[PDB]
Design a protein around this ligand. Structure first.
Ligand SMILES: *CC(=O)Nc1ccc(-c2nc3ccccn3c2NCc2ccccc2)cc1
Ligand SMILES: *CC(=O)Nc1ccc(-c2nc3ccccn3c2NCc2ccccc2)cc1
Ligand SMILES: [Ca+2]
Ligand SMILES: [Ca+2]
Ligand SMILES: [Ca+2]
Ligand SMILES: [Ca+2]
Ligand SMILES: [Ca+2]
Ligand SMILES: [Ca+2]
Ligand SMILES: [Ca+2]
Ligand SMILES: [Ca+2]
Ligand SMILES: [Ca+2]
Ligand SMILES: [Ca+2]
Ligand SMILES: [Cl-]
Ligand SMILES: [Cl-]
Lengths: 236, 5, 236, 5
């Protein structure tokens, strides 16, 4: 790895600098380097890794959607033939996106998940695994699409099972997992009723546990609860 | 598009 | 070049797609490829080239400024020693930025400027040459700083001389050149009075020529005139 | 920062 000669602490320091500079590709490369040092990641470090790749892949997804929309319009009736370029360029962005997802999934598999024993780390990583398979599913159109979808579902489900056993219903990781698994159901698995049920139950169980929280924990939890409500409003 | 985190 | 096997028209088509997807690094690579085909660029193509690199280098400049500010704070009294990482990472971004500028300057030198005979193309390219030397000047701190500054000044001045002879005072290229040369004077050459004089004279000469214009030309010209006024308001 | 185009 190109980061093999840099100290772990220096990689972390630079990831934080990259974040301040909105240099998310750099941030992701620094955090990949840090992961490849082989030590477990702290809570803060795990969130640097997730922020970095979320921003990188988020940009790719947004571009893919623009290009996919243009390509779809080109295959409508009465659309003039413009040649292979739209498809080629959509494929280029798609391949880059798939590469980033495979990189993240590779980090999780080698060896973040297997060393993650505490619920907060294990659920965090399994949520990421579900998320990055979900992004692969968004662009999948071939013979492996069902298997990609099932890989997302399996990771989310393992995360859900651990989170329900080991975390309070207001835990932000548990809430964010549920938010995203609900979106998986709606947007990927063609299961809007499951999506709505999950979001509602998650919201209601969190509401009932808010009384146990400090002011700062309350603020954190209610932010994600509002996202659940926002999705429910979109879907009903 | 729906909210994810 | 990696774009050597792609048709010129396909490179142009893809640059436009990249712009729609806000993939400016891709856009710049496509347009570099197009330039390296060796044919002159049309007005539209010249503006695709400039938009692409403006966005790429604009992101680099913004990041450089963030990092430079952090580095400056680290060298204040009572600042804790954090090691070489801030400097290293600022240097990394700086080197990338310098690389992009050298790439653009290389395109202009090989061989866009020498083949540009019409005022609209020649002034456009010389403005770009001034701009990219100006960006090099923003980060220069060594023995070549004066020469970099003079290279910017020389390019802007040649562009100004042609624009004054061959273009109306409302021409958007002429206006944008003057806007940027004025900023060069203020921010790079430590010449705020020259900056203010240039912006004012440019604005006033354009005002007096607006009567000659169509509605659409009027709209174009007055947009840049407002930027001159905005700078004058900032500086006075 | 001042405006440029
Ligand atoms: C140690 C750990 O992982 N803890 C943790 C606390 C808070 C968050 C978090 N909270 C919010 C609120 C609103 C938006 C985003 N939020 C995050 N980050 C995104 C995220 C990532 C994983 C799981 C849930 C949410 C995260 C982690
Ligand atoms: C053929 C050619 O180069 N013509 C040209 C017309 C308009 C513009 C232009 N006008 C504005 C208004 C506001 C903001 C930005 N504008 C541009 N682009 C930036 C620019 C580049 C070079 C010189 C001036 C302005 C450009 C070119
Ligand atoms: Ca070490
Ligand atoms: Ca037709
Ligand atoms: Ca074509
Ligand atoms: Ca593909
Ligand atoms: Ca462990
Ligand atoms: Ca050809
Ligand atoms: Ca101290
Ligand atoms: Ca350090
Ligand atoms: Ca340097
Ligand atoms: Ca010519
Ligand atoms: Cl392509
Ligand atoms: Cl670095």
């Amino acid at each position: 790895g190109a980061m093999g000669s840099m100290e772990r602490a220096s990689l972390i320091q630079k990831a934080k600098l990259a974040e301040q500079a909105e240099r998310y590709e750099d941030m992701a490369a620094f955090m990949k380097g840090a992961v490849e040092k082989g030590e477990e990641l702290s809570c803060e470090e795990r969130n640097l890794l997730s922020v970095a790749y979320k921003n990188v892949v988020g940009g790719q997804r947004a571009a893919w959607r623009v290009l996919s929309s243009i390509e779809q319009k080109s295959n409508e009736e009465g659309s003039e033939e413009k040649g292979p370029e739209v498809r080629e360029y959509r494929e280029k962005v798609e391949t880059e996106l798939q590469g980033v997802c495979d990189t993240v999934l590779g980090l999780l598999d080698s060896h973040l998940i297997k060393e993650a024993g505490d619920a907060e780390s294990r659920v965090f990583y399994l949520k990421m695994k579900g998320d990055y398979y979900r992004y692969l599913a968004e662009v999948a159109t071939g013979d492996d699409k069902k298997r990609i979808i099932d890989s997302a579902r399996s990771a989310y489900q393992e995360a859900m099972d651990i989170s329900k056993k080991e975390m309070p219903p207001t835990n932000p990781i548990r809430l964010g997992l549920a938010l995203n698994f609900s979106v998986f159901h709606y947007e990927i698995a063609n299961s809007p009723e499951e999506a709505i049920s999950l979001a509602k139950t998650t919201f209601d169980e969190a509401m009932a546990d808010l009384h146990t929280l400090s002011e700062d924990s309350y603020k954190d939890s209610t932010l994600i609860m509002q996202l659940l409500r926002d999705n429910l409003t979109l879907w009903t | 598009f729906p909210a994810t985190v």
